Amino acid sequence: GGKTKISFYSYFKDNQIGEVVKGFEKKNPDITLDVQYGQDPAQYISTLQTRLAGGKPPTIFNLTMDNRTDVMKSGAALDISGEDFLDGIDDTNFALFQQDGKTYGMPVSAWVGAFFYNKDILKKAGYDKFPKTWDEFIEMGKKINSNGSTAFLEDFNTQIAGSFTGLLASYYGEQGKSGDLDADIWSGKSTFTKDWTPVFKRWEAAAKAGVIPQKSVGLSADQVKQEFVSGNLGVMRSGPWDLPDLQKSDIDFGVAPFPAYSKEDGQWINGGPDQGFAIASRASDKEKAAAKKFLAYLNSEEGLEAFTSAAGTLSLSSKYNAEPPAELKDVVDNYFKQNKFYWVNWPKSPTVMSTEGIAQQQKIVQGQISAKDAAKALDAKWATL
Fold this sequence. Notes:
The chain is of the alpha/beta class. It folds into two domains: 1-107 and 274-322, Periplasmic binding protein-like II (D-Maltodextrin-Binding Protein, domain 2); 108-273 and 323-385, Periplasmic binding protein-like II (D-Maltodextrin-Binding Protein, domain 2, 3-Layer(aba) Sandwich). 42% of the residues lie in helices and 15% in strands. The strands form three sheets. Strands 6, 7, 8, 9, 10, 12 and 13 form a seven-stranded mixed sheet that branches. Strands 2-1-3-11 form a four-stranded mixed sheet, sandwiched between helices. The termini are far apart. 45% of the residues are buried. Keywords: Signal, Transport. InterPro entries: Bact_solute-bd_prot1, SBP, SBP_1_CS. This is Extracellular solute-binding protein, family 1. Belongs to the bacterial solute-binding protein 1 family. It is classed as transport protein.
């Protein structure tokens, strides 16, 4: 077999995955890895699709939230079900990289998001601890707004609202669901009208209470952050990416999971896999073997440390975990490590569906449509994909 040449068409830039590549090459002298780097996500998915269709598909590539089902449906990804290099990563992490019960990709890292709160604003409203349930969150918000302060603002412009997603995650998680929480909808066993309506109702109730305010529509993430840092804002949705700015600020802040839909222990955080890694089904035997060694390295202590530290993400594998920043210890240890994180990762036309969801959430906040109308619009849109 001698040396084996393989290729990797990477979604990740060199500043995120280059140390992994370097380490792998150093430790596998029999494998020559040729890496090409995507320029941006749109360009990545179209260029990868072309390369997978051509005469020389990349041996290793990424399943992203925008191409995962298109690639899997094509047959271009190798079935890696049962491979030993998957060990250490909880099974719920593979749902987004499965088709027909077979595993076609492996995530090793994740992002998270949660509620960041101004302890002083909360204390003034009589709270020494963050609300556990959404109803308590609404009651807390009303009190904060009473004091000329603003309870909560959120960026509704660029994505489905993180607070809504957290509430949705709880709605499902309280029923015993895990992994791909919206799977009843994806599989046609349920609908947005059945399952999202009740969540929209509770989310709408916070809007009607003034806690999700109309002045929040049109705000960017940066504008929300500016209000928080200025001491004007009780609560914002954010994530580890904002910690440096929050620590620099004058704010005594804490970090809490999203309030539960109904149960005292029903809290979830936002989060999801930072893409998946896949091997080409159209590759030589030796190439496949070498690619499996690369996936194994990625899911190793050395690989995981290198990747998560460069990318600023969290490990999904028990072979490595970083010590979280103190402020994030609860959210990491009691939610992320307990698989209580979720994001709506649509399996079809994710841009189309996010756009519709953004439009509907804004109309709910503005009192223009009911919860059931918003859910019916999502069903109507989904039924056309």
